[PDB]
């Protein structure tokens, strides 16, 4: 069948969170909780839906009632913000299955602001007659900031591509790109990259693209 798991999750350092995995055949089959860090390493947190392996944090309990097993991170910590997948079986041949994984985020408190950094197309880049404008944004917490470019004060919606990664222990980042016809940038006027940091109507503007 299918195993349900909340799409995400959020807990504040020190406090405690609860991830639920609902499985129709849970009552009949065991559960297993795994942890996947940005590093992509698979970590077995709990097994037999309530027996934690030595070497793992005691704050990782794993109860399980009826058709819903649960991982419980007591006094959640920072280095705990990663992916969580519940595992179990189904059918006569005990088929195996994972949940849709859960993305818990650990709130800290130090609300920082954006740190944009636009970058004009490379000379050799234009050589290939290509204008790829890289607009970055650093040191910010928490909410994702929608980095929208603008041309002469009018949003741009073509050839763009952005992300919303988060690494550097307590430090979020992004890499909002933007392609452009070499003869579009050479013939452009006000290449922008408006960032919108959470909590504030933020607009680090930094209206770039002006010099030569």
């Amino acid at each position: 069948y299918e195993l349900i798991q909340p799409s995400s999750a959020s807990v504040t350092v020190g406090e405690t969170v609860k991830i639920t995995c609902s499985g129709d055949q849970l009552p009949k089959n065991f559960a297993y909780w795994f942890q996947q860090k940005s590093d992509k390493n698979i970590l077995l947190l709990i097994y037999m839906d309530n027996k934690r392996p030595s070497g793992i944090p005691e704050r990782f309990s794993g109860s399980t009632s009826g058709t819903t097993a649960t991982l419980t991170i007591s006094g959640a910590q920072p280095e705990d913000e990663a992916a969580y997948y519940c595992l179990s079986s189904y059918g006569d041949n005990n088929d195996l299955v994972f949940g849709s994984g859960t993305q818990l985020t650990v709130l800290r408190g130090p609300k920082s602001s954006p740190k944009v950094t636009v970058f004009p197309p490379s000379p050799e880049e234009l050589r290939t007659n290509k204008a790829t404008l890289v607009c970055l944004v650093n040191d910010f917490y928490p909410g994702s900031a929608t980095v929208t470019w603008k041309a002469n004060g009018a949003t741009i919606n073509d050839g763009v591509k952005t992300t919303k990664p988060s690494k550097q222990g307590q430090n979020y980042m992004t890499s909002s790109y933007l392609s452009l016809t070499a003869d579009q940038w050479k013939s452009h006027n006000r290449v922008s990259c408006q960032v919108t940091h959470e909590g504030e109507t933020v607009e680090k503007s930094l209206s770039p693209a002006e010099c030569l």
Partner: protein, 239 residues
Amino acid sequence: DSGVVQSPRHIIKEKGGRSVLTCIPISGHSNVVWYQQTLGKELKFLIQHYEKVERDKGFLPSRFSVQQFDDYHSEMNMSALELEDSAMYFCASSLRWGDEQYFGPGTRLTVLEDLRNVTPPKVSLFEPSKAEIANKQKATLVCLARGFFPDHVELSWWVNGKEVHSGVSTDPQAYKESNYSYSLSSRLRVSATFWHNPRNHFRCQVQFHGLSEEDKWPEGSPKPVTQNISAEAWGRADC
């Protein structure tokens, strides 16, 4: 029924586990009492009930709470099971106060630390000895069930599809081959003539008892469930 009924007859569980025992008293009898036999056989009084759930208490652990029903069906609620609770829980019944009690088949439950330690046995049929046959004019078939844990087994001999007891001798109690490994052997003796008969079948069946419905078995190997493992051989080895 004019006979006490007890269920289940075998319960294996892990600590913290929670099971329930059942007892169908002999029809007519009002007085129902639950007894527990521990290591070596020492009948101990738990809680007695007379005509509905009227009671005279005993050493019945608070975790265990039994009650009677209209049909007089009485069940024993076991909760927070511990290795110490590993016993033979018999249920006896009787009529008016003072005359002849009747024990049911009993429910032998075994609470263990690690279920994963449960495991079926390995039946092996060892044929007679050429010597024995010649000298004593007899054929002794040795059967040896090995490496299994909960000594919840019952070896049975089967010759030609029919069960047999004449000439059979199973070990009284299974030995502890290891700390987590038991073993039980038995033997059967038939004439050198019967053994020689190639049209004669011999089967040693070992009824093992494992987990059931509440099969919360680790998803890393086969759940050892109650089962029948055997080993069979025919007549004279062909020369």
